[PDB]
Design an enzyme around this catalytic site. Structure first.
Site, PDB file in Angstrom:
ATOM      1  N   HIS A  41       0.810  -1.238   0.000  1.00  0.00           N
ATOM      2  CA  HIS A  41       0.000   0.000   0.000  1.00  0.00           C
ATOM      3  C   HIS A  41       0.837   1.280   0.000  1.00  0.00           C
ATOM      4  O   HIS A  41       0.323   2.350  -0.309  1.00  0.00           O
ATOM      5  CB  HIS A  41      -1.031   0.023   1.130  1.00  0.00           C
ATOM      6  CG  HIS A  41      -0.483   0.430   2.460  1.00  0.00           C
ATOM      7  ND1 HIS A  41      -0.250  -0.473   3.471  1.00  0.00           N
ATOM      8  CD2 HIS A  41      -0.139   1.647   2.953  1.00  0.00           C
ATOM      9  CE1 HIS A  41       0.207   0.170   4.530  1.00  0.00           C
ATOM     10  NE2 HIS A  41       0.298   1.452   4.234  1.00  0.00           N
ATOM     11  N   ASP A  90      -0.550  -7.311   1.783  1.00  0.00           N
ATOM     12  CA  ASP A  90       0.090  -6.010   1.864  1.00  0.00           C
ATOM     13  C   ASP A  90       1.605  -6.207   2.013  1.00  0.00           C
ATOM     14  O   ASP A  90       2.180  -6.072   3.094  1.00  0.00           O
ATOM     15  CB  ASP A  90      -0.511  -5.174   2.996  1.00  0.00           C
ATOM     16  CG  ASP A  90      -0.143  -3.695   2.909  1.00  0.00           C
ATOM     17  OD1 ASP A  90       0.380  -3.239   1.854  1.00  0.00           O
ATOM     18  OD2 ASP A  90      -0.373  -2.987   3.924  1.00  0.00           O
ATOM     19  N   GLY A 186       2.987   6.219   8.903  1.00  0.00           N
ATOM     20  CA  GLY A 186       4.391   6.571   8.806  1.00  0.00           C
ATOM     21  C   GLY A 186       5.295   5.360   8.988  1.00  0.00           C
ATOM     22  O   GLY A 186       6.378   5.304   8.412  1.00  0.00           O
ATOM     23  N   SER A 188       4.251   2.205   8.293  1.00  0.00           N
ATOM     24  CA  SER A 188       3.896   1.259   7.243  1.00  0.00           C
ATOM     25  C   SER A 188       5.118   0.757   6.515  1.00  0.00           C
ATOM     26  O   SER A 188       6.011   1.540   6.170  1.00  0.00           O
ATOM     27  CB  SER A 188       2.963   1.895   6.202  1.00  0.00           C
ATOM     28  OG  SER A 188       1.639   1.985   6.683  1.00  0.00           O
ATOM     29  N   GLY A 189       5.147  -0.557   6.293  1.00  0.00           N
ATOM     30  CA  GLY A 189       6.214  -1.223   5.525  1.00  0.00           C
ATOM     31  C   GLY A 189       7.402  -1.650   6.369  1.00  0.00           C
ATOM     32  O   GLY A 189       8.262  -2.399   5.911  1.00  0.00           O
TER      33      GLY A 189
END
Ligand SMILES: Nc1ccc2c(N)nccc2c1
Ligand SMILES: [Ca+2]
Ligand SMILES: [Cl-]
Ligand SMILES: [Cl-]
Ligand SMILES: [Cl-]
Lengths: 250, 56
Positions: A41, A90, A186, A188-189
């Protein structure tokens, strides 16, 4: 990261910062010298795919100390099953244009075998989640890399205790329902990293949740064990022209 | 031994085999010791280890 602490410099050495035109985009996890795992995402709204940068050895964003290493992202690989704007599958695999050099401040996290991840790592209760995301819901993001220990829930217990999208078999919940502690926008990932017998492994990717640190809710993380073979196959593959690659999953 | 309980005694990866046979294995940048379960770094910067702490 909400309710955590500064990761002492050098102690989160697999953490990646992804940037788009110099602006903070997302986190990631280094798993070898040319490969970074992140969240699909993160790339839903990329306009110029050629201006994506991964920075390793980053700690304090206000300064340059010479341990940082930046690379162009040559490929973003996303499973065919991922639908932009949704939460399932994701995961993204990123190829760097040039390897990073391993140092005290830049070290990959181990991508475990699937069996070992399912049978052993999935039952380690606590795991570390990290990033330069928001320190508070509706708050400013961190200048210093933050880290947080969070406990993992079996999905049945997550659903029972959560007072949304489904939690699919490609996800898991980790954290707290009391609004004290969470990963946030922020982050994310970024890595959800699991210790076993003196070594750390990638078990999750910071993915989604209701707001940040929302009472009655847990953080939700991509279940990386579902992707081991998919990732390993892509890592043996030759680069293809064009940054974005959608690849069949499974 | 079986890889589903206690990790087959392995520090890292575990393969079951036809019989009461089990093989432990180690990630790239590590080697398996003669005990047949432990993994030791073969490179300066093995995955999943934190050099400032490994130094101390
Ligand atoms: N965009 C995101 C990503 C992860 C989150 C999480 N783990 N908890 C709450 C909100 C979140 C929002
Ligand atoms: Ca810096
Ligand atoms: Cl190929
Ligand atoms: Cl392109
Ligand atoms: Cl060595």
């Amino acid at each position: 990261i909400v309710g955590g602490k500064v990761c002492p410099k050098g102690e989160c050495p697999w953490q990646v910062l992804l940037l788009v035109n110099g602006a903070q985009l997302c986190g990631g996890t280094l798993i070898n010298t040319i490969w970074v795992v992140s969240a699909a995402h993160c790339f839903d709204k990329i306009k110029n795919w050629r201006n994506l940068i991964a920075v390793l050895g980053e700690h304090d964003l206000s300064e340059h100390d010479g341990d940082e290493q930046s690379r162009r992202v040559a490929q973003v690989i996303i499973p065919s099953t991922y639908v932009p704007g949704t939460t399932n599958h994701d995961i993204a695999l990123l190829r760097l244009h040039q390897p990073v050099v391993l140092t005290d401040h830049v070290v990959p996290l181990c991508l475990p075998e699937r069996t070992f991840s399912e049978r052993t790592l999935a039952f380690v209760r606590f795991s570390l989640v990290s990033g330069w995301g928001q320190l508070l819901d509706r708050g400013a993001t961190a200048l210093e890399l933050m880290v947080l220990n969070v406990p993992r829930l079996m999905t049945q217990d997550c659903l029972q205790q959560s007072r949304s999208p489904n939690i699919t078999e490609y996800m898991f919940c980790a954290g707290y329902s009391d609004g004290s502690k969470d990963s946030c926008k922020g982050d994310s990932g970024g890595p959800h990293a699991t210790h076993y017998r003196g070594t750390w492994y990638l078990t999750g990717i910071v993915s989604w949740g209701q707001g940040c640190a929302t009472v009655g809710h847990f953080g939700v993380y991509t279940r990386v064990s579902q992707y081991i073979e998919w990732l390993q196959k892509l890592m043996r593959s030759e680069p293809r022209p064009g940054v974005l690659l959608r690849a069949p999953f499974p | 031994l079986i890889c589903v309980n206690e990790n087959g005694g392995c520090e890292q990866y575990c393969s079951d085999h036809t019989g009461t046979k089990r093989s432990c294995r180690c990630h790239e940048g590590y080697s398996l010791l003669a005990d047949g379960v432990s993994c030791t770094p073969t490179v300066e910067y093995p995955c999943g280890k934190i050099p400032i702490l490994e130094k101390r």
